[PDB]
Design a binder for this molecule. Sequence first.
Ligand SMILES: CCCCCCCCCCCCCCCC(=O)OC[C@@H](COP(=O)(O)O[C@@H]1[C@H](O)[C@H](O)[C@@H](OP(=O)(O)O)[C@H](OP(=O)(O)O)[C@H]1O)OC(=O)CCCCCCCCCCCCCCC
Lengths: 12, 244
Amino acid sequence: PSLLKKLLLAPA
Amino acid sequence: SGGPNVPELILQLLQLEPDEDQVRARILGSLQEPTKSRPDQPAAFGLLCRMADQTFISIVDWARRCMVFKELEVADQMTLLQNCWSELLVFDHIYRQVQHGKEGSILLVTGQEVELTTVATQAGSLLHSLVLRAQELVLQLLALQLDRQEFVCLKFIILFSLDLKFLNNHILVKDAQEKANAALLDYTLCHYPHSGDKFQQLLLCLVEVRALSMQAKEYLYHKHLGNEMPRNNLLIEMLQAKQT
Ligand SMILES: CCCCCCCCCCCCCCCC(=O)OC[C@@H](COP(=O)(O)O[C@@H]1[C@H](O)[C@H](O)[C@@H](OP(=O)(O)O)[C@H](OP(=O)(O)O)[C@H]1O)OC(=O)CCCCCCCCCCCCCCC
């Protein structure tokens, strides 16, 4: 949905 | 000064700060990638948009590693970031100007210098005013002898500068804010030998950063209404987020 959410849910 | 007795939060924040060279190289490499160049626009525009986007990527990456923030769920994080993105970017630019200060020009994250005359002759009145005001803020911060500790502390403060009613985890965020302010006040009281309340002055600086951020949002919005922004622009997505 949003790039921000993908970033925050991206692997660390 | 330097630091014999620095607040723990500030030290941990210093250890959480990313390396400038690595971020620079990453953003440069991200800009080197091929792109569908628009024939009715200077490519430099799109390159700078992507640059700001990547800068915000790095900023988000910095946020994800922060204390308290990493103990939060997705919703709160998204709310905070959507509330302070422009402020974080602007403050990043400003401190980049402070850390490497040539009064006749501005320094981008990529490493290239842009003289103020170029901005004065090629940019619009709005962006010109933005750069000039930002440079005034840089001058003020230089006058107050801003250091790295106060810098990361101020970034952390900005990250949680939001009314508690918009967040789900109230007490944690409140504790974060109070601890941040306490840390800043402690450091400023322990390290500033000059006169004036450096704490309060820095808070004023934060207010100015916020207004400047509002103006930046206005600029990006003007570009957006004219369909000048590239598709799937991260900053535009942040700007179109529901305001809290
Ligand atoms: C949240 C903010 C984060 C920002 C953090 C990163 C800051 C990066 C600063 C980038 C500085 C690069 C400047 C390089 C030199 C430069 O001045 O090149 C031009 C300037 C832009 O010329 P123009 O479009 O303004 O000026 C136009 C232009 O003249 C058109 O051709 C006219 O159309 P026209 O021909 O029909 O008249 C427009 O008229 P109109 O009003 O009608 O639209 C006019 O306004 O450089 C750019 O391309 C920058 C691109 C922006 C990418 C990054 C987003 C920046 C948003 C916030 C500003 C950051 C400033 C820091 C202060 C807090």
